[PDB]
Design a protein around this nucleic acid. Structure first.
Lengths: 1352, 76
RNA sequence: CGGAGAGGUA
DNA sequence: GGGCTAATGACGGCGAATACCC
DNA sequence: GGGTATTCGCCGTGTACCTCTCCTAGCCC
């Protein structure tokens, strides 16, 4: 049939198995592995498995010429086309049924589970050990019971006319033949109507589930016992004997031979009516041989020397490393490809690559032969071979013709992102290296250091067009990770442009007026006017306006000659605001981005190529050169240094004076040297920035330095302020072994010399960095692998699902600083609602419109705090994703379409920057750094005396909503924060709106009265010491961690009553009155001590910063992706309602949460290692923190909802990648998360069991069906759960994924018995089968086929 | 000569079924069954098909009616 | 030549 | 000969198998 | 009580190549 998806696996019926094969092998004969003649009949038969050698007779002795493609029997051979050879396979009809070992050794023993006895009984009967009653005696005997030999006899003499009991597989055959599955299903489901027992109903449901699974699979149980054994053609199994004393594993062949021997012996014995014992023993080792054939890993695996591979068996031949051999490693080397070191060609256009003439000549030999015989220049393949090898001038025209536009695919040896392979048009060049386009090598993440690129030739038409439309660098200029061009000028052309566009204050050609850039070029190339001059030029710049028309605005502009010469490059329809000012790397990035977003791709590609050429040419004309006088040593560097040694000498003198502690003077010296480094760098940069001063008409003037090293990094050509800072100035402070900073920096530059010890110390960092580099490369490869495996089966397949659901999507702000703008995020998304103005309810954007640049700017001017947007997480599409739920941020600027497995794009986009991953304020006083309205969200505070709005808990947020319509400052309000400021109050920058003790957190009382030592035993739960200064005590509560059994049953508490001696409670606040004291809670107030409202109750020391809840780096990325518990989870409010303590510290502590409308017994477990913040009588809500610390994603999903953990994971990974400065659009993280929580557990049972891991898309379809009919089933309520990346990968519905990458035999058996009709939605799965992938062009092709289905 | 696919992207917004249809067009003028409708510049059939679809000459409806045509003649 | 063990490069 | 023939100077995960405080 | 918290064996291995070796083994005729 045609190349389809949605493949069906099931247990085969014997009749159609016989239909597969043609005849049965008579006698088995196999090669001796020292004699390689295929002996017939046997495993090598050219009548049943097809011709082993085609177009000739083969019997092992016969090699006659006669049957060379004609059907006729001469000695028992059949010769046909190789197609019949592939389909011709064997079968052997066994006289006795035989079981399949996989369903026996599997933990879910399919025979055992179906027949409802432990697998010991089945292995006993199959191994010919103990008899089993096959629906035998029932009046006194038992219908289905195992029997020993004496018991079997006793039953036989008891009854022989109503009793039957067999041995081996025939017994299970008779048993499974008996059941009518439908009768069992009907009786069980109708019994469930009457049964009222929970456990009984569970058992009935499980049995009926299994029976319905077998019914729906369409497999009769009698089938899964092997009645006729199908056997492979000999060439379809691994076989490679080696000459000499060394050979190769070929156990499959002699296992076939042994099985055929056993079956033939049994047939002979049965033909002769041999007695029961002998035939039973023959069946016994026949079954044993068949089982060993099916697997030897079910028979016990072992490691053989010289090959980390177990002994060959059919099951082990199912899966090797890394999986199905011919679809992944190892090792898929492919023809029509080459590999060679790379050189730069700065003359090639962006769609071209320079390819050596010999490389082309040997890459296109078949095409060249075809052309040569097409022109009549050759009459045969031999003539073509001679013609090409003679290197005649004629073949050059032939190769030019076959290469006129035939593109080629270049791939870097590691491909860490999508651009790692790109197409180009090959230009035949002299040499022996591939001349790569200079501007593309940055996208390839390659260099020119001997590294070798690889070429492939897409050689059919359709592959060529797939290359041209998609693979070529012209169509792939934006990064598929965050959008934005990836084809940015990197180091040389940017230097040329930065030089040419710079200005001076005086040079030849200053001040005059010239007719357009015409005369600018004419005068500069005359050498009459310097390239740099304040010149007024009448330029005619074109602007896109109206419906897309061009208006030629002509005006006189104050520019420089070189800038006009560059303006010649820029096509029409671009503003002159881009080609003014000194062009940096970010400036040229901006120019290319604007050109793409304003004109399109063709103007963009032409602009890029022309600007490369001009940048190179004027870099050459510049002669920007690096020497040693160019790098400038600050004159005062030594002075600042000597001041630093003077300061550290004073500090160390104090140290020997015993005036400073070790850490003290250590930090002092470190700060002194950091300040010295800063001063040196400042002096060096100040020297650079105006190193060239020029008079205008007599007075000296500063201007951009002609110094070549200043352009060298200021352009962003190569280097940074740090690097040119460490050449001329000191590279200074760095880490030592154990990764700590040395007291004495590297006080020497590179322009000046390095002392021996200095270079020795510096070597530590270099070695550490290189080892880090290697390890990170390996780990990044592994992470890319796991992420691709988890995300690959995800393809955009629908345009719109109408899901008005979405995510709140906000500019991320930490502290006073806005880390990222909402402007950046919003771009490329689709709104989940119609946004309004920050002042009026007017509709700003229409229904679910794409938010491209225009709408993003319209939202910028109408400043908005947040937008709800369509997310793949919110997407309700099944077996795919809505396009409008996704956005369009790709190497394209138009709305994404169907296909294009964005999961793989996301995985490669997350793994690409993996290599770049490396291993007054909060907790003191909140100081708002900007003037704006104060805003508090989720307050835990009661206004008490002295105007104290004392906020408790960590669930409160301080936003700064300024008078524009969005926030600019964000803070987290800690426990017991004291605020003299109200909401919507303008506050000075850095003013303490909230103040508290930095190095200890107090418990500020919001009520006043007596203090009661509730739930305490003096000297058992708290320390006994009272130091009175104002009625205070020094009693300290013992640590939160586990303690004695007489001090962990009562948790210390300080009950605060009013001024009337009566208990009081405040609802809605996580401070009822009784502050249940956590660990190291120094109790300040004794019993009966009177205080005011705003006084500390208990003091718990804090670090004033320095908490370790994040590690950062690629391991942090990985363990977030695996959703591992971060230093044990911090529990939240498991449900809203009142809370209380249970049996404290029975194991760990217990906390009952009592809802007023739910299930009151709802206690959970509390490890004593957590920082406890939980009281009794307080009212909480889901998401409220109960144990303080790092929160795991699992509870966040279970409690706060799907979008909450979506935001959490997205923010965490995006922050981690920002730490390295890499920017990735968050839709990739969204799709990876939507892959993570693709599995869910049902809470309230539905069409599935009460709790089980189920595809959440299956949950959606099942519930939709449930409301489709009246009869609800049940149901159904579910909660999504986050599996780990590997766990989600192995949780794939399609078994093809698991077959290649997990344990196989059990997975394959589950697929067979369940009859799993996998949609084959997976991509790498379509790779594994060998058919077209459902993505890109392949998805479109299969869609066309489906459209042609039932339409022919 | 034209190797950029912007015009074909605008004509066929999917730009991906575009690849399939242009590939079929190339497949059957490369081998007999249809002949190029745009002057040949020694170009490979890929780019002549691309230039055909750029001009709006080849579209999904036109190509499918043309193909169903060559069948009703080849049965006739 | 099928897969493991070792040096070197990138 | 030959034709048959049934740990230690790695590292980390991971299920099974124990180890232990209240 | 019960969750850590150990012990008790198996097993996986970025990218590509350059060279090298080493590969089911037992055994009665």
């Amino acid at each position: 049939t045609e190349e389809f998806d949605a493949i069906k696996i099931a247990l085969a019926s014997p009749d159609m198995i016989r239909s597969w094969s043609f005849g049965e092998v008579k006698k088995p004969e196999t090669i001796n592995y020292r004699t390689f003649k295929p002996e017939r009949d046997g495993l090598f038969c050219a009548r049943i498995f097809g011709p082993v050698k085609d177009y000739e007779c083969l019997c092992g002795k016969y090699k006659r010429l006669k049957h060379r493609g004609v059907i006729c029997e001469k000695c028992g051979v059949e010769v046909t086309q190789t197609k019949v050879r592939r389909e011709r396979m064997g079968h052997i009809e066994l006289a006795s049924p035989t079981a399949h070992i996989w369903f026996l050794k599997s933990l879910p023993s399919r025979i055992g589970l179906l027949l409802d006895m432990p697998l010991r009984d089945i292995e006993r009967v199959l191994y010919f050990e103990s008899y089993v009653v096959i629906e035998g005696g029932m009046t006194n005997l038992e219908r289905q019971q195992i029997l020993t030999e004496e018991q079997y006899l006793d039953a036989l003499e008891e009854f022989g006319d109503e009793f039957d009991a067999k041995m081996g597989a025939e017994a299970i055959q008779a048993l499974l033949k008996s059941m009518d599955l439908e009768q069992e299903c009907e009786q069980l489901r109708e019994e469930l109507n009457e049964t009222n027992s929970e456990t009984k109903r569970k058992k009935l449901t499980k049995r009926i589930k299994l029976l319905e699974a077998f019914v729906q699979s369409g497999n009769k149980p009698e089938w899964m016992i092997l009645t006729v054994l199908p056997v492979l053609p000999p060439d379809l199994r691994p076989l490679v004997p080696l000459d000499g004393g060394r050979f190769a594993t070929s156990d499959l062949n002699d296992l076939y031979r042994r099985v055929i021997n056993r079956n033939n012996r049994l047939k002979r014995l049965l033909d002769l009516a041999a007695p029961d014992i002998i035939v039973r023993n023959e069946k016994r080792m026949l079954q044993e041989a068949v089982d060993a054939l099916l697997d030897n890993g079910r028979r016990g695996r072992a490691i053989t020397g010289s090959n980390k591979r177990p002994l060959k068996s059919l099951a082990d031949m199912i899966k090797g490393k890394q999986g199905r051999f011919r679809q992944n490693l190892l090792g898929k080397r492919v023809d029509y490809s080459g590999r060679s070191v790379i050189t730069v060609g700065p003359y090639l256009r962006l769609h071209q690559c320079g390819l050596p003439k010999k490389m082309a000549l040997e890459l296109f030999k078949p095409f060249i032969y075809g052309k040569l015989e097409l022109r009549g220049l050759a009459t045969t393949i031999k003539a073509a071979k001679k013609m090409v090898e003679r290197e005649e001038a004629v073949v050059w025209d032939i190769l030019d013709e076959v290469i006129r536009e035939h593109p080629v695919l270049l791939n870097r040896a590691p491909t860490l992102h999508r651009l790692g392979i790109q197409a180009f048009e090959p230009v035949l060049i002299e040499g022996k290296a591939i001349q790569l386009h200079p501007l593309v090598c940055a996208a390839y993440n390659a260099d020119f250091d001997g590294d070798q690129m690889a070429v492939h030739v897409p050689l059919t038409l359709e592959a060529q067009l797939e290359a041209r439309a998609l693979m070529m660098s012209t169509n792939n200029i934006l990064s598929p990770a965050n959008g934005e061009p990836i084809i940015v000028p990197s180091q040389d052309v940017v230097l040329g442009l930065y030089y040419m566009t710079r200005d001076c204050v005086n040079a030849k050609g200053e001040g005059m007026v010239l007719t357009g850039p015409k005369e600018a070029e004419r005068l500069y190339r005359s050498g009459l006017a310097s390239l740099h001059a304040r010149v007024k030029v009448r330029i005619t710049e074109y602007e896109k306006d109206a419906n897309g028309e061009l208006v030629a605005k002509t005006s006189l502009k104050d520019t420089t000659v070189g800038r006009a010469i560059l303006w010649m490059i820029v096509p029409k329809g671009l503003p002159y605001s881009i080609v003014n000012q000194a062009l940096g790397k970010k400036a040229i990035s901006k120019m290319l981005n604007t050109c793409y977003r304003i004109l399109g791709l063709k103007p963009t590609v032409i602009f890029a190529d022309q600007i490369m050429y001009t940048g190179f040419a004027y870099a050459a004309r510049s002669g920007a050169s690096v020497g040693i006088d160019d790098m400038v040593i600050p004159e005062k560097k030594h002075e600042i240094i000597s001041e630093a040694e003077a300061e550290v000498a004073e500090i160390q003198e104090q140290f020997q004076s015993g005036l400073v502690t070790a850490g003290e003077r250590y930090n002092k010296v470190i700060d002194i040297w950091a300040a010295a480094n800063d001063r040196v760098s400042k002096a060096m940069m100040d020297n650079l920035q105006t190193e060239t001063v020029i008079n205008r008409d007599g007075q000296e003037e500063k201007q951009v330095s002609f110094n070549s090293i200043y352009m060298m990094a200021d352009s962003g050509a190569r280097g940074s302020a740090a690097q040119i800072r460490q050449l001329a100035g000191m590279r200074g402070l760095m880490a030592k072994p154990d990764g700590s900073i040395i007291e004495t920096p590297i006080t020497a530059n590179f322009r000046e010399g390095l002392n021996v010890l200095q270079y020795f110390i510096s070597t530590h960092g270099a070695r550490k960095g290189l080892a880090d580099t290697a390890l990170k490369t390996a780990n990044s490869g592994y992470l890319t692998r796991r992420l691709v495996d988890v995300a690959q089966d995800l393809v955009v397949t629908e345009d719109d699902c109408g899901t008005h659901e979405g995510i709140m999507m906000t500019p991320v702000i930490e502290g006073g600083d806005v880390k990222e703008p909402l402007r950046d995020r919003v771009l490329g998304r689709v709104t989940a609602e119609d946004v309004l103005k920050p002042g009026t309810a007017d509709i700003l954007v229409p229904r679910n419109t794409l938010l491209h640049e225009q709408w993003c700017d319209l939202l910028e001017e109408n400043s908005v705090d947040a937008v709800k947007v369509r997310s793949v997480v919110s997407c309700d599409t099944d077996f795919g994703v809505c396009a409008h739920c996704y956005g369009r941020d790709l190497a394209r600027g138009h709305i994404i379409n169907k296909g294009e497995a964005i999961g793989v794009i996301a995985a490669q986009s997350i793994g690409e920057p993996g290599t770049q991953l490396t291993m007054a304020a909060a907790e003191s006083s909140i100081q708002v750094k900007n003037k704006g309205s104060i805003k508090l969200s989720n307050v835990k505070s009661v206004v008490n005396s002295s105007g104290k709005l004392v906020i408790t808990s960590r669930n409160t947020e301080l936003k700064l909503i300024d008078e524009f319509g969005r926030t600019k400052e964000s803070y987290k309000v800690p426990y017991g924060a004291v605020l003299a400021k109200g909401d919507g109050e303008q506050v000075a920058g850095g003013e303490t709106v909230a103040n508290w003790d930095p190095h200890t957190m107090p418990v500020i009382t919001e009520v006043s009265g007596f203090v009661r030592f509730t739930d305490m035993i003096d000297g058992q739960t708290i320390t006994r010491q009272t130091d009175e200064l104002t009625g205070l005590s020094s009693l300290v509560v013992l640590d939160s961690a586990e303690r004695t059994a007489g001090g962990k049953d009562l948790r210390p508490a300080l009950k605060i009553v009013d001024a009337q001696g009566n208990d009081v409670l405040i609802p809605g606040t996580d401070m009822p009155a009784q502050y249940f004291l956590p660990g190291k809670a120094i109790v300040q107030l004794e019993d009966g001590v009177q205080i005011s409202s705003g006084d500390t109750l208990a003091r718990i020391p804090q670090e004033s910063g320095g908490t370790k809840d994040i590690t950062g780096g690629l391991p942090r990325v990985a363990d977030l992706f695996e959703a591992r518990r971060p230093k044990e989870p911090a529990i939240l409010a498991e449900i809203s309602g009142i809370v209380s303590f249970g049996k404290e510290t029975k194991g760990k502590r217990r906390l009952v949460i009592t809802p007023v409308d739910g299930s009151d017994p709802y206690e959970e477990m509390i490890p004593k290692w957590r920082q406890l913040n939980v009281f009794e009588g307080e009212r909480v809500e889901r998401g409220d923190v109960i144990s303080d610390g790092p929160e795991a994603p699992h509870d966040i999903l279970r409690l706060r909802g799907v979008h909450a953990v979506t935001r959490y994971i997205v923010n965490e990974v995006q922050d981690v990648y920002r730490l390295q400065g890499v920017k990735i659009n968050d839709k990739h993280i969204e799709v990876i998360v939507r892959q993570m929580l693709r599995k869910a557990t049902i809470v309230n049972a539905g069409s599935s069991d009460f709790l089980e891991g189920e595809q959440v898309e299956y949950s959606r379809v099942k519930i939709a069906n449930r409301e489709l009919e009246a009869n609800g089933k049940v149901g159904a309520t579910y909660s999504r759960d986050l599996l780990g990346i590997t766990k989600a990968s192995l949780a794939t519905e399609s078994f093809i994924s698991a077959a290649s990458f997990q344990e196989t035999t059990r997975v394959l058996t589950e697929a067979a018995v369940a009859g799993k009709r996998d949609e084959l939605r997976g991509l790498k799965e379509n790779v594994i089968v060998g058919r077209l992938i459902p993505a890109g062009t392949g998805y479109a092709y299969h869609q066309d086929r489906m459209r042609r289905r039932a339409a022919g | 000569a034209r190797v950029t696919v912007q015009d074909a992207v605008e004509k066929i917004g999917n730009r991906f079924d575009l690849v399939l249809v242009a590939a079929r067009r190339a497949r059957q003028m490369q081998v007999g069954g249809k002949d190029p409708l745009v002057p040949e510049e020694n170009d490979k059939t890929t780019v002549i098909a691309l230039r055909e679809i750029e001009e709006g000459l080849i579209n999904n409806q036109i190509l499918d009616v043309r193909e169903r045509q060559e069948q009703q003649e080849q049965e006739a």
